[PDB]
Design a protein around this ligand. Structure first.
Ligand SMILES: CCCOC(=O)c1ccc(O)cc1
Length: 481
């Protein structure tokens, strides 16, 4: 009969919702701050917002009663509108356009009406879903006063969420303590067996072998496992959820090697999606030819992209002596094994390849902070909105360098146009038609290769559960049995 759960996870690159880029950022943001809506089967359930009304042009949220910060401040529309305003101006340009379709939403409170009104500068369907993501969590006025404070840990009175980070050992352990004065839980349709933990010790594991060993020796209760480690556990200690959707991102900027489309195609010709799946997921994942799974909106709509066939001969002629800075996330298979496979397939095509296999936190700083610092990566996307928009955004609009969402610096006139008619779309069908065509275009012009959807495998000790509701990625519901 304990009240403490010890969860394995990767090192955060920030504890501030505004600077969140990597899963560990969202995992911590999830405990400390409440979002307006939360994920569940068939869509989104009321969280800090009791209900909402609106289109893709504009949503109005009505804030719930009895909602309160870790200092006591009543959570009013002014607090919420201030938090979402602070987010829109302080967060990464990437995550802001992903949320509001742009950098300049209209956000306004009305403490009388009890409403918060958001008005995308152009219509944005992804807004409602985007506000279920941990990084949109409400920062109370204590947090807005000190943004440098939120990066590194708890600023007193900032938390809108059920926990406060009471103890910190940077890059080692983040100890979260449940607060006595919180009953503002979301309106979950789903019913969860077991007790909300009083104390959550978010424990940094350096690698998957370590993760497994510490479940098994009882240093951890819950932790992520690499597919090879499955056989070490009974089926009943495992909880398997579809997670990241993996696709290539090239540095396409004028002067870089993958500016030239003929180089991008050569990479496509050298990557066996079967071999890549075997090395990355060992068949626990699923191939996908788009920016999601079959559960992703529009992901089965026409057309299906025409992937480049393997041509290792044609790739050898093209990539001979070509210098490729391959950036790797260590989540892309055990210890970044998928990145290793990709390097190896480029090496045997005669490319001069240098792979940097880094932790998810370091990877995320590099991709979103210094986009010119690499040529190619396997991008493990977290499709938070459950649409194809997540992935299309990464290749269209203004560059990241110009405060856009365009990670790769790719200029696809077709894909850019199809992104815009997705916004002007009268019906869901036209929207899907636009989105599916945008992905097909991007695949045809060798702007990406869609790879797979991975499985997030939690291994857990007796007495401990963990649930992911409505295809959620950053809302791991820990329970003590
Ligand atoms: C896509 C944004 C950063 O990605 C992650 O933090 C991530 C993605 C997939 C995973 O399985 C783990 C982390």
């Amino acid at each position: 009969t304990t009240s403490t759960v010890r969860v394995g996870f990767d090192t955060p690159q920030s504890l501030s919702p505004f600077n969140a880029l990597a899963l560990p950022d969202y995992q911590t943001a999830r405990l400390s701050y409440d979002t307006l809506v939360r994920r569940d089967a068939g869509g989104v359930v009321p969280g800090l917002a009791a209900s909402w009304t609106g289109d893709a042009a504009q949503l109005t949220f009505t804030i719930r009663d009895g909602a309160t910060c870790s200092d006591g401040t009543e959570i009013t529309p002014t607090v919420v509108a201030d938090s979402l305003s602070a987010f829109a101006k302080n967060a990464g340009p990437s995550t802001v356009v992903d949320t509001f379709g742009g950098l300049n939403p209209a956000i306004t409170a009305d403490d009388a009406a009890g409403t918060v009104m958001i008005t995308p500068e152009a219509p944005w369907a992804d807004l409602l879903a985007a506000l279920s993501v941990a990084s949109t969590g409400i920062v109370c006025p204590a947090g807005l006063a000190n943004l440098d404070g939120l990066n590194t840990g708890s600023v007193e009175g900032a938390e809108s969420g059920p926990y406060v980070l009471s103890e910190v050992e940077p890059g080692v352990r983040y100890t979260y303590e449940l607060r006595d004065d919180y009953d503002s839980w979301p309106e979950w349709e789903t019913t969860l067996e077991g007790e909300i933990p009083k104390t959550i010790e978010y424990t940094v594991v350096k690698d998957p072998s370590a993760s497994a060993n510490q479940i098994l020796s009882g240093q951890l209760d819950l932790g992520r496992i690499m597919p090879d480690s499955r056989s070490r556990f009974s089926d009943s200690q495992l909880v398997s959820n579809p997670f990241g959707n993996f696709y290539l991102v090239f540095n396409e900027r004028e002067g870089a090697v993958f500016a030239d489309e003929k180089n991008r195609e050569a990479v496509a010709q050298v990557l066996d999606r079967d071999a890549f799946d075997q090395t990355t997921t060992d068949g626990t994942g699923e191939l996908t030819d788009t920016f999601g799974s079959k559960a992703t909106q529009c992901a089965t709509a026409a057309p299906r992209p025409a992937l480049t066939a393997l041509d290792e001969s044609a790739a050898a002629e093209t990539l001979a002596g070509v210098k490729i800075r391959l950036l790797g996330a260590q989540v892309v298979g055990a210890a970044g094994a998928g990145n290793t496979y990709l390097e190896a397939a480029l090496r045997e095509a005669g490319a001069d390849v240098t792979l940097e296999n880094v932790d998810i936190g370091t990877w995320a700083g590099r991709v979103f902070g210094q986009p010119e610092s690499y040529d190619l990566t396997v991008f493990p996307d977290l499709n938070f909105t459950g649409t194809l928009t997540s992935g299309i955004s990464r290749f269209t609009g203004p560059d990241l360098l110009q405060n856009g969402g365009n990670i790769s610096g790719a200029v696809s006139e077709t894909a850019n146009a199809l992104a815009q008619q997705a916004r002007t779309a009268t019906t869901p069908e036209q929207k899907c038609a636009a989105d599916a065509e945008a992905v097909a275009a991007l695949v045809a012009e060798h702007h990406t290769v869609p790879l797979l959807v991975e499985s997030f495998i939690y291994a857990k000790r007796d007495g401990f559960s963990v649930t992911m509701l409505g295809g959620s990625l950053d809302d791991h519901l820990f329970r003590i049995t």
